[PDB]
């Protein structure tokens, strides 16, 4: 369903739509008033259009049969498609200037936002649910405004990367219970390879900039790698792999996977785990926000621990959340910190476990003296 | 294995240099209840050891350093250093000797600086505390959180300061030497720890005038002789040693200052003295004036008829030459503050060879040649020299930003003033550390010192020079922000914080509008604060307000937008933390809005009248958000005021209705009450917004339309049902026992004392036929209630009490106007 | 009180200093002039030894102050959500605006002489990439209104008095090699949280006035606390004036990209954006007047608020003629299509009365002389 | 609960009694060997006041036992020193001390 929504949803990924025209040859012309225009969204893959049951929905791309989900725009209101041109066409629409009015070439309807605000809207976030009206009201005119490329590129990266890891979710719980035995794979083949290269390729997408660098271009590429990492997280990519470490967890051993997916998935798992868990550190690596969303699940990272697939993995996820948030220390409980100690005392003598105990006293130049206690009270008196 | 190996077991080395690094994180910022644990790991005699151990490695040697600062003196410094930026100067001989300039020969219009951080000052600082480490100790039978906070783990001071001395003496010298193996591995690993070291104990105060003087030696031979061996100034050294060097120099500029500042008090010292004598003696000659003079005698005897603060304006205007007829001061007085002044704009390096001759033109030159000497890379070292080289320039203006902080005391309260500033220290230590159960115990009893501190009500300016109104609402905002949502912990520090601020309001006018300038900030943070009970940080800002007509004026209306869109979701949306407890739902929360309402009671009446501008903000805002006013006045679907009213009187009587049905928390929510009380409060501000009665006998329009508008919204008839509802009354019976209603749960006079007001101010009483309809329903039932119950058993009854007060305050006043 | 309050002699010592310095303070200290502005940036600017040195290599290592213009522009570059209040850049940008200006016919001779002195220490600062620094602030304030952005205004004046073609020109260059969109972003928001006159704060300052209090240690009569009406007065004027000197001498490369920027991914119209303040500031001074329609004689408080008023709106009619001349036709038309006309008809309707009102009476000359002007 | 064994005997004749303080060079000891305290690494006397208990009960009835110059060796039971909740940070809960105590002077 479609909005008209504000806020700081108007910079994120789902605010993004493609101008698709009717013609495959010369569809990057100029656009001239009143002719024949698909609409598409960009990170799910879906066309603008009118449906008999729920009016004015965006509709899978298996199912736009050019007349419901046709458009063109216009500069008035008058009720009024031209012969096309071989060319680079009339230029004469503008950015950032010239007032659009987008119509609905099949029932000629127009866009207007819906007037009625129930009692769920009576105090709550202002959400216009627009509906394609057969006259509507008056200041429905839209602005058409530029956005990068990194944005545009990192929106289909978004919708390329959610079909093939929900693919992967999908064959990942198919074969949940069912042991293969001496048998084939129950189900259809995992996308192994698909899904590691697509892997390498996010953990070089969000490569942290170099140290050398100078001072006045390295601060560009970090508000670039914050803004990527904040359009994946706000678009459910932080979520998703969550999903994806919680099916390939349940498997303690690769021998263990192999009696549920197969002898030729086995040998591709620990390298798998190791890659999602960089990509985890990779997404969260830097933000408050995407890191403050492990408050409510602090305890799923720390549990995984003692895991030995992955334990500089792990180790390197949970120092990225607790040198960022310093919301998230509030949180920590003897559990943990007597977890962490268990490390030291079962991984050898590993500094970064020092690097975590550190970061969890001080915290922005403000201590926690409940883990400072802690540590001391579990850490220090056992001389070992 | 010896330590010493670990220059070449790098493994070992790695996990030992992160190992002190967690030793200095869990001792970070004060936490001397651990300090004191890390001594047993690491003895005193270790770290001795380590100071002057030549074959260390460089983390371990800067690490065992820090380790040492950590420990032992960090917490004292970073105290001491907070105090440093304060100058209150006692009057003592000791800071009536005190001078700019030492005594000597050199010349006339200024002498030889003298050597900076050398000499006796009188400003006060509160002396360290520490405690012997001895951990065979009995455990203290206190329970924790109620015990005394543990002091810094003792360390010897003459011995660690000369050991200091020595090591950066032969620091000093062993480069010179140019030596191809420093000590550490590396000339930063060699000087930096070692120069954190004389950095903290200088900040400390440690050293005496003999090392200081040893100190600038070490720093410059020459241009500090008092009347190889190359100094830190000229050794070629890396980026970091700068750093530390730039803090010295700090220090002694900073030494400098407060210098100025104790010698400007010593002269305001004679000055006053002299002042006062000689405008004494001018009384005594104006008294005998008369016999001698006419009408012209109003121009001298202006000066004795001028408050203070501006007699001395008038007795010191004399700087520019063309008005020294105002100026009744003889010349020698008038020679004696411009010698002051210009001696002063010397020392201060106004006006008045490679040698600097001085620390201002010696520290210019340094940073100076610094910069072109090679691209500084380090952005806090860059920031450090280019602050130093703004004060050296700018003498003048650095004593001007340092005069509003200055203050001079009697010397019959400085051991008053030395319990304020350790109290006051125990409030700044509280900025930089979570908030526990421990520390809450600290600093409700570090308030209560202040509050039995006679200082805090004899110099209430002091209180805002040392700022501690902002230290406290800064504690009370991260306590507030921490959990915003769900709920506030510890209630029992906020309920002491802001009764400390509302005392704080009340001492002074001034201190009322320095609390006043936060008040948008308290408004933003008072949107959860209403969950606890008792004094709310709501009742800080209202307690900014009272009573100040100023004030009330000067109240931005952007704030009271603020209050009524809170006071439109108190009238939208349950509270959750009544909801939590089982109360039955009901669409809005009456205690909140209640809280907001009786601060707008505040915010639109000063001094028993009211205010025009924000009265009629206030109304203006109200109905343009009709849900304000609550589930009755809603308009549209919503029935009438008077139903709400029995509604919530019925809810009030009836248990299992009025709350969650399973005082006891000794302020159990009643929800027939809060709604009652919700009204009663709107009703009363609306009272209290109407027009008085002059702009109605002038004919003013918008005092008209005003009006017109309350009446529309109440009428006078529901009003006069409210004021004709029964009360119930305290009954005796069943062998004496003296019964009385739960006022927390019942109809309260107080809520008629709102409906007479309303009704006093709005419709008033103007005919004999509709005052007598109102007194024989309304009043008289009262009336003679309250005459019944004036026996030997209920005339100290609680409710008795509140009838007495409710006529004598509400209707009596009424009848007595109404009485032609 | 005044004839039985205490004399000061009687006073204890402590109570008495107190007030001795802080008379002091304002009567000697803050009275007195001390010129070190000039005397930083001279030896500053000197790159000292360095010929002695003769280094081989081009990059020829920064003097002192590019060092202190480099730092602020790298805390000034660096990714941060807010901007602290940094007391020495604040310093120092008041140091490095206080070094330029410096300043019954005279030779048109001298004055060849006083603006090539005035020029060159402009260049000592622009060569040394202080233009860069001032847009830098600028886009770095995110638009709140504040001491720290107004020394940087101070200084992006103070380096383009006169209209200097070298910091326009580099300026230009930086804003469109780099596209970034934070600095229009921020001085549309700087512009629309200006402030206009307000009947309601006039009525509360005339009560607050009336009732004339004082404090209790001694006695400030008719104290001059902070002005509630246009207190960011001097701030509109010299963000305007900022702007006028970014345009002035028909700078039409700059005039157009004000207009709209080609390279940045969304256009500000700052045009557009100028003269919706102005029709704000029309009609606050439209209800000044209609308020004082019914009075026959304008007070003290409702002069010195028309003066601080009509100062403002000159500047931004000035400023509006910049962006003009030339003349910008594209700017033409926009002002052609803007609210412009609107804000005439209201000024001429202003003026129409005052003119009347303000004749009649010898009180009003200055503030008649002061509107004259304006229109 | 305390055991004490000589060391290096001193007087054997003048015995701590109440009303004079007590001075010593204790040097703490864990059971398995681990040192945690002394008094010489501070390099200072511990002058502890016997009767108003100041110490634990084994440090004290043990320095109560002893003599003037005499050298003393202890081993405190968890019920006569910190105990179950030991001491934060320094001794682990339930924990048996020894202490290597000269007695080296009265008040």
């Known amino acids: 369903l479609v909005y008209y929504e504000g806020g700081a949803v108007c910079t994120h990924a789902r605010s993004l739509w493609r101008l698709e025209p009717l013609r495959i040859s010369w569809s990057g012309s100029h656009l001239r008033w009143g002719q024949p225009l698909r609409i598409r969204h960009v990170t799910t893959g879906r066309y603008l259009a009118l449906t008999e049951d729920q009016?004015?929905?965006?509709?899978?791309?298996?199912?736009?049969?050019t007349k419901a989900t046709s458009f063109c725009f216009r500069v008035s209101k008058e009720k009024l498609p031209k012969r096309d041109v071989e060319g680079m066409g009339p230029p004469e629409i503008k950015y950032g200037e010239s007032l659009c009015f987008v119509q609905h070439v099949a029932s000629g309807l127009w866009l207007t936002y819906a007037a009625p605000d129930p009692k769920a809207l009576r105090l709550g976030v202002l959400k216009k649910k627009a509906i394609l009206h057969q006259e509507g009201h008056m200041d429905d005119a839209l602005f058409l405004t530029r956005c990068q490329q990194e944005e545009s590129q990192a929106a289909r990266m978004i919708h390329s990367t959610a079909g093939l890891y929900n693919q992967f979710i999908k064959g990942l719980d198919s074969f949940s219970g069912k042991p293969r035995g001496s048998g084939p794979?129950?189900?259809?083949?995992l996308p192994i390879e698909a899904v590691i290269l697509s892997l390498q390729d996010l953990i070089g997408y969000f490569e942290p900039p170099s140290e050398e660098l100078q001072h006045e271009e390295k601060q560009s590429k970090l508000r670039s790698l914050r803004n990527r990492q904040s359009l994946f997280q706000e678009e459910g990519m932080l979520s998703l792999v969550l999903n994806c470490i919680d099916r390939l967890n349940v498997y303690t051993t690769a021998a263990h996977f192999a009696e549920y997916a197969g002898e030729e998935a086995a040998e591709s798992w620990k390298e798998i785990v190791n890659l999602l868990y960089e990509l985890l550190a990779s997404?969260?690596?830097?933000?408050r926000a995407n890191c403050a969303l492990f408050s409510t699940n602090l305890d799923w990272v720390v549990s995984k621990l003692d895991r030995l697939e992955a334990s500089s993995g792990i180790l390197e996820v949970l120092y990225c959340v607790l040198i960022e948030s310093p919301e998230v220390l509030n949180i920590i409980q003897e559990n943990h910190i007597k977890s962490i100690i268990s490390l030291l005392d079962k991984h050898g003598r590993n500094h970064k476990v020092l690097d975590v105990l550190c970061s969890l006293c001080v915290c922005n130049g403000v201590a926690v003296r409940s883990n400072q206690d802690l540590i001391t009270e579990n850490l220090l008196p056992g001389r070992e | 294995m010896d330590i010493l190996e670990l220059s070449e077991r790098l493994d070992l080395q790695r996990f030992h240099s992160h190992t002190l690094r967690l030793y200095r994180a869990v001792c970070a910022l004060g936490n001397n209840r651990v300090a004191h644990a890390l001594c047993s790991h690491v003895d005193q005699a270790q770290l001795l050891h380590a100071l002057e151990d030549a074959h260390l490695p460089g983390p371990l040697r800067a690490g065992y350093y820090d380790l040492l600062i950590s420990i032992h003196l960090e917490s004292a410094c970073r105290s001491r250093r907070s105090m440093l930026s304060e100058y209150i100067v006692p009057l003592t001989p000791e800071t009536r000797a005190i001078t700019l300039f030492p005594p000597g020969r050199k010349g006339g219009n200024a002498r030889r600086h003298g050597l900076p951080g050398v000499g006796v000052t009188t400003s006060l600082r509160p002396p360290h505390h520490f405690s012997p480490p001895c951990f065979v100790a009995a455990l203290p039978a206190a329970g924790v959180a109620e015990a005394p906070a543990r002091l810094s783990p003792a360390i010897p001071l003459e011995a660690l300061r000369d050991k200091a001395l020595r090591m950066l003496g032969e620091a000093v010298r062993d480069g010179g030497q140019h030596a191809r193996d420093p000590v550490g591995g590396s000339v930063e690993f060699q000087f930096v720890p070692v120069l954190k070291l004389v950095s903290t104990l200088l900040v400390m105060g440690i050293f005496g005038d003999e090392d200081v003087k040893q100190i600038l030696k070490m720093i410059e031979p020459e241009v500090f002789t008092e009347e190889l061996e190359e100094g830190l100034l000229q050794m070629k050294l890396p980026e970091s040693v700068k750093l530390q060097m730039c803090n010295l120099l700090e220090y002694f500029c900073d030494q400098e200052l407060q210098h100025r500042v104790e010698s400007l008090a010593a002269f305001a010292e004679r000055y006053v003295d002299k002042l006062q004598a000689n405008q004494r003696s001018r009384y005594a000659l104006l008294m005998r004036a008369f016999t001698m003079s006419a009408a012209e005698t109003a121009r001298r005897t202006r000066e004795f008829r001028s408050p203070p603060q501006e007699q001395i304006n008038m007795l010191?205007?004399?700087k520019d030459e063309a008005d020294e007829e105002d100026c009744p001061l003889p010349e020698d007085i008038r020679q004696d503050l411009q010698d002051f002044h210009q001696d002063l704009l010397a020392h201060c390096g106004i006006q008045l060879e490679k040698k600097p001759q001085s620390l201002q033109e010696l520290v210019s030159h340094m940073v100076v040649r610094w910069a072109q000497e090679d691209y500084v890379q380090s952005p806090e070292l860059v920031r450090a020299m280019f602050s130093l080289l703004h004060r050296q320039y700018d003498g003048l203006g650095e004593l001007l930003r340092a005069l509003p902080r200055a203050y001079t005391i009697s010397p019959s309260s400085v051991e008053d003033t030395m319990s304020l500033l350790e109290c006051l220290g125990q409030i700044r230590s509280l900025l930089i550390v979570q908030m526990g159960p421990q520390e809450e115990n600290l600093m409700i009893q570090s308030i209560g010192n202040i509050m039995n501190n006679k200082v805090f009500y004899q110099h209430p300016n002091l209180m805002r020079a040392?700022?501690?109104?902002?230290?406290?609402?800064?504690?009370?905002?991260?306590?507030?922000?921490?959990?915003?949502?769900?709920?506030?912990?510890?209630?029992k520090m906020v309920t002491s914080c802001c009764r400390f601020l509302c005392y704080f309001c009340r001492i002074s006018r001034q201190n009322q509008r320095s609390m006043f300038d936060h008040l948008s900030y308290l408004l933003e943070n008072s949107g959860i604060g209403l969950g606890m009970q008792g004094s709310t940080p709501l009742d800080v800002a209202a307690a900014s307000v009272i009573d100040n007509n100023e004030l009330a004026l000067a109240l931005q209306e952007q704030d009271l937008e603020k209050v009524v869109s809170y006071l439109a979701g108190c009238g939208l949306q349950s509270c959750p933390m009544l909801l939590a407890k089982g109360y039955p739902d009901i669409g809005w929360n009456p205690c909140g809005g209640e809280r907001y309402l009786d601060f707008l009671r505040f915010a639109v009446f000063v001094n028993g009248?009211?205010?025009?501008?924000?009265?009629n903000v206030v109304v203006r805002l109200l109905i343009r958000k009709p849900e304000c006013f609550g589930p009755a006045l809603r308009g549209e679907g919503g029935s009438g005021l008077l139903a709400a009213i029995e509604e919530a009187i019925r809810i009030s009587e009836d248990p299992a209705r009025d709350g969650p049905g399973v005082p006891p928390e000794?302020?159990?929510?009643?929800?027939?009450?809060?709604?009652?009380?919700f009204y009663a409060a709107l009703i009363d501000l609306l009272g209290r917004c109407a027009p008085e009665m002059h702009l109605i006998q002038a004919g003013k329009g918008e005092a008209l339309r005003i009006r017109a508008i309350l009446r529309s919204l109440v009428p006078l008839d529901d009003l006069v049902g409210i004021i004709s509802l029964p009360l119930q009354i305290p009954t005796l019976g069943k062998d004496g026992a003296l019964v009385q209603p739960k006022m927390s749960a019942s109809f309260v006079p107080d809520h008629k004392a709102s409906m007479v007001l309303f009704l006093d101010r709005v419709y008033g009483i103007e005919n004999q036929d509709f005052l007598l309809h109102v007194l024989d329903v309304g009043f008289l039932p009262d009336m003679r209630a309250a005459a019944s119950l004036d026996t030997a058993t209920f005339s100290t009854t609680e409710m008795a009490l509140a009838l007495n007060r409710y006529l004598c305050l509400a209707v009596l006043p009424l009848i007595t106007k109404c009485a032609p | 009180a005044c004839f039985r309050m205490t004399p000061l002699y009687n006073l204890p010592t402590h109570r008495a200093c107190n007030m001795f310095l802080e008379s002091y303070k304002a009567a000697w200290i803050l009275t007195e002039d001390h010129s070190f502005e000039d005397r930083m940036i001279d030896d500053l600017s000197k790159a000292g030894e360095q010929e002695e040195e003769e280094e081989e290599v081009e990059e020829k290592k920064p003097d002192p102050l590019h060092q202190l213009v480099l730092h602020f522009s790298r805390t000034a570059l660096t990714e941060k959500s807010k901007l602290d209040e940094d007391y020495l850049y604040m310093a120092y940008a008041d140091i490095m605006a206080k070094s330029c200006h410096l300043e019954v016919e005279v030779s048109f001779e001298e004055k060849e002489m006083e603006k090539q002195r005035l020029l060159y220490q402009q260049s000592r600062l622009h060569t040394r990439g202080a233009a860069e620094m001032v847009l830098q602030m600028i886009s770095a304030c995110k638009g709140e209104t504040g001491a720290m952005v107004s020394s940087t205004l101070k200084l992006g004046i103070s380096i383009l008095n006169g209209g200097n073609a070298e910091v326009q020109q580099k300026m230009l260059d930086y804003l469109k090699d780099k596209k970034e969109v934070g600095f229009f972003q921020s001085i549309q928001a700087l512009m629309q949280t200006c402030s206009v006159l307000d009947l309601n704060a006039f009525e509360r300052q005339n009560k607050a006035e009336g009732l004339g209090m004082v404090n209790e240690d001694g006695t400030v009569i008719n104290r001059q606390n902070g002005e509630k009406v246009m207190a960011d007065d001097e701030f509109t004027q010299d963000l305007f004036r900022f702007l006028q000197l970014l345009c002035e001498g028909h700078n039409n490369d700059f005039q157009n990209y004000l207009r709209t920027q080609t390279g940045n991914t969304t256009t500000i119209n700052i045009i557009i954006c100028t003269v919706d303040y102005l029709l704000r500031l029309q009609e606050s001074i439209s209800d000044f007047y209609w308020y004082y329609s019914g009075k026959?004689?304008?007070?003290?408080?409702?002069?010195?608020?028309?003066?601080?008023?009509?100062?403002?709106?000159?500047?931004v009619f000035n400023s509006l003629t910049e962006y003009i001349q030339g003349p910008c036709t594209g700017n033409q038309q926009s002002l052609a299509h803007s609210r412009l006309w609107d804000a005439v008809v209201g000024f001429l309707h202003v003026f129409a009365h005052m003119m009347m009102k303000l004749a009649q009476d010898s009180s009003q000359i200055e503030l008649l002389k002061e509107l004259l002007d304006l229109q | 609960g305390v055991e004490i064994e000589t060391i290096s005997p001193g007087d054997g004749r003048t015995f701590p009694k109440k009303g004079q303080t007590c001075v010593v060079h204790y040097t703490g000891m864990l059971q398995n060997g681990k040192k945690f305290d002394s008094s010489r690494d501070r390099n200072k006397p511990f002058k502890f006041r016997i009767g108003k208990q100041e110490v634990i009960k084994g440090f004290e009835e043990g320095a109560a036992q002893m003599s003037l110059g005499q050298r003393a060796k202890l081993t405190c039971t968890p019920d006569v020193a910190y105990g179950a909740t030991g001491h934060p940070g320094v001794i682990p809960p339930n924990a048996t001390l020894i202490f290597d105590v000269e007695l080296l002077n009265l008040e």
């Open chain 1, 283 to 287: 997404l969260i690596r830097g933000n």
């Open chain 2, 316 to 318: 010191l205007h004399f």
């Open chain 2, 609 to 615: 009248e009211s205010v025009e501008e924000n009265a």
């Open chain 3, 296 to 315: 026959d004689v304008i007070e003290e408080q409702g002069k010195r608020n028309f003066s601080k008023a009509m100062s403002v709106a000159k500047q």
């Open chain 2, 666 to 677: 000794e302020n159990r929510v009643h929800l027939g009450h809060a709604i009652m009380s």
């Open chain 1, 55 to 65: 009016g004015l929905v965006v509709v899978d791309a298996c199912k736009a049969h």
């Open chain 1, 185 to 189: 794979p129950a189900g259809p083949a």
């Open chain 2, 466 to 491: 040392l700022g501690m109104h902002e230290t406290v609402m800064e504690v009370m905002v991260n306590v507030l922000g921490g959990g915003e949502t769900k709920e506030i912990r510890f209630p």
